[PDB]
Amino acid sequence: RARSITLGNSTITTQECANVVVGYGVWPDYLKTAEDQPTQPDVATCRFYTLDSVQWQKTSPGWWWKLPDALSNLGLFGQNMQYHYLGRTGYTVHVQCNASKFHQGCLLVVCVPEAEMGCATLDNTPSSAELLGGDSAKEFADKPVASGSNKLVQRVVYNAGMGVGVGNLTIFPHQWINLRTNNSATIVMPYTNSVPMDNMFRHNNVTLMVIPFVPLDYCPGSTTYVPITVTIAPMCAEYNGLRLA
Amino acid sequence: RARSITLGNSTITTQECANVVVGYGVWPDYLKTAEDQPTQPDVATCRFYTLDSVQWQKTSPGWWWKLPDALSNLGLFGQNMQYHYLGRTGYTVHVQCNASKFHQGCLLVVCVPEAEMGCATLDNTPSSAELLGGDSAKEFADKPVASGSNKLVQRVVYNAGMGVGVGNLTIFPHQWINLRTNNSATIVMPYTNSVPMDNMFRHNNVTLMVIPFVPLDYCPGSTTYVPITVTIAPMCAEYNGLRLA
Amino acid sequence: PGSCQFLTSDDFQSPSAMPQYDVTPEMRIPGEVKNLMEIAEVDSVVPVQNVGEKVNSMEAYQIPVRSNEGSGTQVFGFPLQPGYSSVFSRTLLGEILNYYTHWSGSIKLTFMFCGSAMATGKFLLAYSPPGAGAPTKRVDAMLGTHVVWDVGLQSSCVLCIPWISQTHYRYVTSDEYTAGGFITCWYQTNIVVPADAQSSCYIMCFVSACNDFSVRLLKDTPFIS
Amino acid sequence: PGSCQFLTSDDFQSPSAMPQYDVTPEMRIPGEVKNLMEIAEVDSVVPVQNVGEKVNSMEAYQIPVRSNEGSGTQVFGFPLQPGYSSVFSRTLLGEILNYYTHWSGSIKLTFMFCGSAMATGKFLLAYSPPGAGAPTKRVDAMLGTHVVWDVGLQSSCVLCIPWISQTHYRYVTSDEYTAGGFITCWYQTNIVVPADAQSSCYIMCFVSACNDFSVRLLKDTPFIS
Amino acid sequence: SESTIENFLCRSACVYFTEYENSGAKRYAEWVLTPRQAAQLRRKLEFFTYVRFDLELTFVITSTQQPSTTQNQDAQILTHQIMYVPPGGPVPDKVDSYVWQTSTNPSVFWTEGNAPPRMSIPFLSIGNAYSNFYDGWSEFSRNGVYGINTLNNMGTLYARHVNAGSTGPIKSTIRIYFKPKHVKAWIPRPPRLCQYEKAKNVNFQPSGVTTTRQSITT
DSSP states (O other): OEEEEEETTEEEEEESOOOOEETTSOOOOOOOOTTTSOEEEOOTTOSOEEOOOEEEOSSOOOEEEEHHHHTTTSHHHHHHHHHOSEEEEEEEEEEEOOOOTTOEEEEEEEEEESOOOOBSSSSSOOOHHHHOOTTSOEEOBSSOOOOSSSOOBOOBTTTTTTTSOGGGGGGSSEEEEETTSOOEEEEEEOOOOSSSSEETTTBOOEEEEEEEEEEEEOOBTBOSOEEEBOEEOOEEEEEEOOSOO | OEEEEEETTEEEEEESOOOOEETTSOOOOOOOOTTTSOEEEOOTTOSOEEOOOEEEOSSOOOEEEEHHHHTTTSHHHHHHHHHOSEEEEEEEEEEEOOOOTTOEEEEEEEEEESOOOOBSSSSSOOOHHHHOOTTSOEEOBSSOOOOSSSOOBOOBTTTTTTTSOGGGGGGSSEEEEETTSOOEEEEEEOOOOSSSSEETTTOOOEEEEEEEEEEEEOOBTBOSOEEEBOEEOOEEEEEEOOSOO | OOOSOOOSSOOOOOOBSSOSOOOOOOOOOSOEEOBTTTGGGSOEEOOOOOOGGGSSSSTTTSEEEOSTTOSSOEEEEEESOSTTSTTTTTSHHHHHHTTEEEEEEEEEEEEEEESOTTOEEEEEEEEEOSSSOOOSSHHHHHSSEEEEEETTTOSEEEEEEEEEEOOSSSOOOOSSOTTSOEEEEEEEEEEEOOTTSOOOEEEEEEEEOOSSOEEEEEOOOTTOO | OOOSOEESSOOOOOOOSSOSOOOOOOOOOSOOOOOTTTGGGSOEEOOOOOOGGGSSSSTTTSEEEOSTTOSSOEEEEEESOSTTSTTTTTSHHHHHHTTEEEEEEEEEEEEEEESOTTOEEEEEEEEEOSSSOOOSSHHHHHSSEEEEEETTTOSEEEEEEEEEEOOSSSOOOOSSOTTSOEEEEEEEEEEEOOTTSOOOEEEEEEEEOOSSOEEEEEOOOTTOO | OTTBHHHHSOOOEEEEEEEEESSSSOOEEEEEOOSOSSHHHHHHHTTEEEEEEEEEEEEEEEEEEOOOOOOSOOOOOOEEEEEEEOSSOOOOSSTTOSSTTOTTSOOEEEETTSSOOEEEEOOOOSSSSEESOOOBBSSSSTTSOBSOOTTOOOOEEEEEESSOOSSSOEEEEEEEEEEEEEEEEEEEOOOOOSOOOOSSOOOOOOOOSSOOOSOTTO
16 A cells, blocks of 8 residues: 655655655755844745655666756745755655566665765866756766866766765665565655855755666567656745845 | 474575475384393484485486495494494484476385385395495486396386385475475484394385476586485484393 | 983973963863773775785675586685785774784674575585694585575675684785684585576675774884885 | 974963063953954945045035935935945944954844934935845836835834855955945935924934854954055 | 773874974974874774873983084083963964964973973864764865864964074974773774775775685685
8 A cells, every 4th residue: 555745746656665764864954143144944945855866777887966956947046045045954865766576676766964975087177067967967987087187076886976986875865676575665854054044055965876786677669668757845944134224 | 493303413595484294293213131132222323324315307217225235335324233232213314405496396205114226137035235225325217127048136216216106206205396396305313123233234225216297308518417415313323232131 | 321312212291382371171082092902993895806806896895606617515604804904904904903912802704695685595604623734625614613594585694713813913805814723715505596596606705803802012114115 | 292382372471571560450440341353343424425636524424415406316326335446445344354364144234314303305225135236227226125114204224134254354345346245325206394494404324233243264464465 | 901092092292303403494393283193093092083181291402512613612512492372362373473482382491411301282173073084075165174173173283492502503393193082982893904095084095894805714
């Protein structure tokens, strides 16, 4: 049997058992300086924003979506980021994947905080175009990016673009997806940052990475892809007060 | 969901429902003549001994494993049989068979006591080589064994080599395996013999027969065999005391 | 004797360069590390297939399983020393253990069969005691501390190997360690798949730590050049 | 380590050069300063018209208001950073704030219309939030945090702008600060005067501080050459 | 017990070595406080995202007599001045500048032949924690460089010779030791794996996952 979770206008279908993964044992609650720093909360912003689906094929390295940037163009969240300046928010990823019993694979859904990416050329830093992809996921690469006089972000799948071992990414809140057992993944991310409030257009709070460790395999005749689908809901988001004390 | 049963070093996976078949309503308990006949029990001997798997194909008559002889070469049981002389033991067969939903067949797992086999030539008796197979199962035959001047054990599948109707073997502790319902069979055999203790190298206590009544059938493309797997655990085994009263 | 000398490892009180300056109070940031042991208790994917160009790719982690030609053949095998060993020296556990000169404890190993929902087989995970050598055949492996793992019922099998300790000083690289055990996998049964289902499937391994783990005499990391 | 060294910022006890000498007892002199914050809470006239030779005169402080040609035209405007800003860097508030590297708090602004007792008009004082740019027209200003100030009824209007903090390190001089708000004045209505009464009138501004003001990391003053 | 962050990130590490003279073009030293230059300490610090700590600086100043031909020498005792410029403070453009006298830069005078000079710097962030990793731009405009928050500014460190001791040339070397204190760390992250290239960025060259072996059954 399935379930339905209605947040505002949106409604989404989920399994009775969802095994939610709270980020660091902390639920994204509100903020606990009077007139000097007034703050105003926004509620309607909370709702289920469904991003474009991505086709998972046999030759598919991986994907990455910056959580503040991805919704920077959709509904109130896209608007509020343009109007208010300082804002703090928490998230609830809902990576769902549908494939038959005759498909086989494995995916790692990991929420990485402060994922500072590397650059092909050691001398310079990556351009925001090759770093930020709006209304569309950014893909990894199998072979290393050719270095030269360019600002291409390093995108090899094994180094993960942060220059670490991709087998150790488990340290961060994560969840595996075995196409023979688990079919979805839920991760609740609290607000992780040095400051109580930060500018949302100049700093990405969390990064969502989905990398297939085991390649998708199927027999000739089955559907030749698997449509991974991501749903993001901003949680307990508050912004600065534009009033006058 | 599955289960795990740890006997000594060994660990085996079984279904939550196993429908165990206790042999004759009796659990293989210990023995209930002072100094004249001292007896010493052995415990570590008890553990799960996994025998070699056998491939079940469309043209496969059946198999047979002598329970004392099969373990005569494996671990402590093989050793104890060489050191001590008299010994009494009970068994716990764990015939497991794994095949998909697109396979069809039926097997009879029967524990026969004092299975005295026949001989092709009426004048003589079968040789121990053609009768006892160690570290390897012995197979039945479709057509009758040609009689002559030989010691070949009669191995026709229908007569069962004991010269009876193979449909009446049910009288003994048994269990069926329908590839569409049951996937395993557990049979606990108590110690059945005229004497309290017997020599283990000169007398087989129980015989394990696995005969497929319905032939394995599959469509072109599925795996062309089914790996039957047998696990034997000696239970409540005791041997003579080698001390001096 | 022992005064007016600068010792790098000393704990004394120092005169503050800038006094009368109010430091910012602390706030609640999620996920505060108290000890390094907690990090070493997160399961990390283990590159079992670090063979040739497999390391410079993503297939190093996945272990290939083939139904054909595996009546009783070995699937994989590696010694049981975390730090100093090609298969475990780069995991989280191994990276924490490459900082200390003396470490003892227990290791947890998790295997996850990643194949179709319609594939069934059996495997024979065996643990060789430290002094004993790796098993030659499937029988030798069975006559020991094995675990028959059925992938139809359970999709994941967990082990808890004890008697794991430092085997050498400084840093050494060696296959078949004398004072360390070996974990090997054998094909008890072959992979049985129906029609229109891939029979080639892969496994994955995750190494963790346990409550009974000690680490002493911190030193320099050998991975820095 | 850390002894037999002279550190400029240290608090130790010193041997008195002249002991056995009775210092004169203290008396009650009026107006004892306890903290520098009290000084920063006295309203100071703000030179809004620091345009050209206006600074080298007395007309820098006064803001000129003309009834003619002001249907909806802007009267004045300036960013909201006290220290480091031409309009506020020289007031009492700005002079205290140019000693500290980190300061946050709220600012009070008072406007006093200095004209005849027979002149009536309206003004539209608007506050732009930090990120938002200064309003282009009177409508844009109205659709925000405005205060319609009628000079017939009230002769003085007071504001209390919050979210005021340090925007840069060291010292910078820049018009239109990115992380600071803008205060602008628009002519809602024109100045209506009877016969035999001047229609050209002036305004004045006074900047103060508030109870919620912090100042840390004292440094050198940049006005000394 | 030895794995607590207080016992893992509190080791006196040498993070800078230079030399200044009483004569010639080189006359003073400077070093912007930054902990990313020594890779042995950088790799340990990069196990966590946000770390909050205090600094204990120890300076080892040793002077050697430079080879020369100046006759009739008789040196006096050398006195050094180490001026620590706090964030947002004036910095000297030359040795005999008027910035060495400013009162808000806590300089320490030390006379040759005693216990080494040492001063402690408190948490200097205007925020609540230093950020080892930053996933943003320094400025809202495109001009701002990527991954360089202006909130991890620990200041700068200038050293010089208060007086020229003798008439001959003398070269003095200064070694700086970094000892973090009261260390709190949040959000642990995976180790480097790759080698370091620069001190300003996380740029790297793609490398293998681990070292190879003969076979999977070996």
